[model samples]
Target: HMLSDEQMQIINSLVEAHHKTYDDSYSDFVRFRPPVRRLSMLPHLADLVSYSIQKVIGFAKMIPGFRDLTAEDQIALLKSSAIEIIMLRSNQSFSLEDMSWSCGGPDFKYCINDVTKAGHTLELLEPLVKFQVGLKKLKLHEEEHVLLMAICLLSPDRPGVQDHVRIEALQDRLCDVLQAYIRIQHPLLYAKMIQKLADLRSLNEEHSKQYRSLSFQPEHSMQLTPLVLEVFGSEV
Candidate 1:
């Protein structure tokens, strides 16, 4: 887990550059767009069902008993299981809300049923949940888990006034959450994905810069030309 001095320097530099570029570029992009401060509390029941169906079907194929069932019976079983999955997701959301009410502070009292509020909540929770999930993946003790959960619960949820800042920050947090979930749920597969991500980083970086470039003027367009060429070649 220890990083070499060179590695530390690389990471620090990368992080610094990333933050600086993102912050400046985002501030400019939001000048024309309406500020998005609120999010929804409405749970995505349909999405939950869709994801659950895929999961259940994959699981069913792996079970010996499921294979013994006739094709028609298997279809029926899957249909029934999909409903169960939806119920499970609904119950999980209910439990999450209950726990929040029992232990959460004033901010948790805000019933977010719309897109904006949910987005903000997820933005705030993603990093903390990701950290806790990471420790869990490392097979850490319950005390560590409890500590991480507590820290996550206490983290701030206020979305920044600036649209670009809020969007970029949330995007980074979501990435962390996804990485943590993948690491614990499918470690080997996640490792492969991370390798792919590493391969894509430079390209992703250029893509990000190109997005930022849109905020720049005609004079700055020249600066972006190389970045665009690197990403898309000179064909255009």
Candidate 2:
């Protein structure tokens, strides 16, 4: 967007919150991990999932009106929305150049195979990588990235949201802010960006479904994080 001093200040505030909620260094793997199958992989991915979940919740709280929702309403939104927002935020670790993910450092930078061994299958990972590519290709400015996340979080249509009437109002406002930013920031790509939001919805459905399946299998469930079960399984 053309830099109105007003526009610049609002975006700067959002970028500040985004940076505060996240840090680049996440070392879920230290020392050598087994050149192994699903055994160690899920644990690392599980740990990372829990970590990201918590941070996204923190980021949600920082959005201007999010905490204003009742705690029950807040819980519903977080449960329904957190997975997709994390998926959206996954671009940070995504290496479009390498088609991989670098979680903590060089050692943790992961290719498809690194995370594919479990029942996760190419079904989940393939579309995941593709989505990451599309998101990264957009190369949103920091404000755009954070604003997109805020809009994603406030989405009113998520199944099970109780105060959706209020939630819709909040999402509408965020969308307007996003529209204002994209008014000049990425005019051509606005529809494309909203398309990503649609893609994220379907992605979350698969993500939540797959996680539930993982919890059902005895072996996978054995290693699954409680946070994972509670967050994704709650959908059932």
Candidate 3:
């Protein structure tokens, strides 16, 4: 069944609350700060990413039915899908005109090229920036953003899931809810919105490959935190 008005309102509220939590956690470091010490900054950057993922996972638990999953399944889902959530959350800090990430505020930004020069690969940054731009172009509503994160969590293909069928069923329900909401609120763009979800998967795959490569490069002085390593190693 389609989401009732009350359910939609609840979802919207959840989205707002979750987004603020995400924004406060990592948005401050979205852009490159001066001093370009890539090695020294790696640990801090990794921590920021880790913190952002934690916030998303914390928010996910509040979603209806999420808490009902076995603890093992919950961890498996978050570890597998955290990067996709990071990608989505980081989109809030991207600046299309400058082709860069904004600083603590939009008034300041850094070029993607500079970030690449600091040891990041275009392979990683390009797809990330492109996806964020495409996502921004969609002008997604708060509820759409929140539903997308939920869909990311419910993915059944993540390795080590003990109850794949249950996860898949949950994902299907969220998809239905998102589709229904879009149909009611954006009838003309329903198909386009659905297509964007598929696009997110493609971007996630590309980002994961580059992320693995970047994390292991010898030039970087710092290692990923255990939590970050676990998420990246989970075979998303």
lDDT (10s digit) by residue, model 2, range 1-236 = 45566556656766887888777765434532333444557766676677788888888888877888998778778889888888888788788778987776565777788777555778778898899998999888777889889888888887778887898887777677777887775426768888998988888888777777778889888776677677787554
TM-score of model 1 (CA atoms): 0.24
Q: Candidate 1's residue-wise lDDT over 82-119, tens digit each?
A: 33222222221222423221112332232333222323
Give the residue spans of candidate 2 off by over 4 A: 1-10, 27-38
lDDT (C-alpha) at residue 88 in model 3: 78
Model with the higher TM-score, candidate 1 or 2: 2
Whole-model lDDT values for every prediction: 0.32, 0.77, 0.70
| Stretches > 4 Å off in candidate 3 | 1-6, 24-41, 105-110, 114-119, 217-221, 234-236
TM-score computed on alpha carbons, candidate 3: 0.80
- Candidate number of the best lDDT: 2
lDDT of 3: 0.70
| Model 1: residues with Cα > 4 Å off, grouped in runs | 1-44, 89-236
Local error of candidate 2 at residue 150 (angstroms): 0.9
RMSD of 2: 2.7
Predicted candidate 3, C-alpha RMSD: 3.6
Poorest lDDT segment (10 consecutive residues) of candidate 2 = 27-36
Which whole-number lDDT from 0 to 100 does residue 195 have in model 2?
92
